[PDB]
Every structure is written in C-alpha cells, then in structure tokens.
Amino acid sequence: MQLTPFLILLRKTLEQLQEKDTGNIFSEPVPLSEVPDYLDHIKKPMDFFTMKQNLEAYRYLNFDDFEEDFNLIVSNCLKYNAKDTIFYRAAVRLREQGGAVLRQARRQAEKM
Numbered sequence: 001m002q003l004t005p006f007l008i009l010l011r012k013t014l015e016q017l018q019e020k021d022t023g024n025i026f027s028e029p030v031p032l033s034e035v036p037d038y039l040d041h042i043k044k045p046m047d048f049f050t051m052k053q054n055l056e057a058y059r060y061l062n063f064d065d066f067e068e069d070f071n072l073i074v075s076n077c078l079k080y081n082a083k084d085t086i087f088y089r090a091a092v093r094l095r096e097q098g099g100a101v102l103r104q105a106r107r108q109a110e111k112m
C-alpha cells in the first residue's frame, strides 16, 4: 500500500477517536502536577496528542501499532483509576466506542 493514503486514514481515525473523548480527559498527557504518583503505576503514558505527534513522525506504519497506543490510553486509565470513578467508566466507554471506530478504519485499511 501507499503511505500517504494510509496516514490520512490514521489522521481521520484519530480525530474520530478523539471525538469520543467528550470529556477531553485523553486528548493530552495526564498532568503529573495533578497526579504526582501517576508514573509510579503507569509504565507508558499515552494520549491522543502524543499519538498525533507519533503519527506525523511516521511511528505508525500499520494499524496494529496505531491500535496499540490507543489501547494504552484505555488500559492506563482502567489501571490507575478505581472502578467506581468517572474516569474508569470513561475508559470503558472509550474502549467500546473507539473499538467500533477502529474496526471500521481497519476495514477501509484492508481495502487498500
């Protein structure tokens, strides 16, 4: 496949995913000022802005690795936060809704 169409597809998929983050709690790195003990539990932080940066740095050359970092956004949040928190439920919703976005984008990818 050709790189340029693939990357415009990842750009579109990334904005579709970011759209699901209505609370805007995944679109920027978790502020270590608000959450000082965060990197004590979270080995690799991830967020949609970082993903965009990674995309443009050509770090995503297949959907698996793109999807890998999205999954980090979700799993980091499930790991750090108690089940009874808004944050945890947000991550579950993102897993669900983002999963559907990803399945479709992958389908368009398979077409390529």
Ligand SMILES: O=C1CNc2cc(Br)ccc2N1
Pocket: 025, 026, 030, 031, 034, 035, 076, 077, 080, 081, 087
């Ligand atoms: O796990 C998280 C996801 N994002 C976030 C943003 C702020 Br602001 C504060 C805490 C978190 N924790």
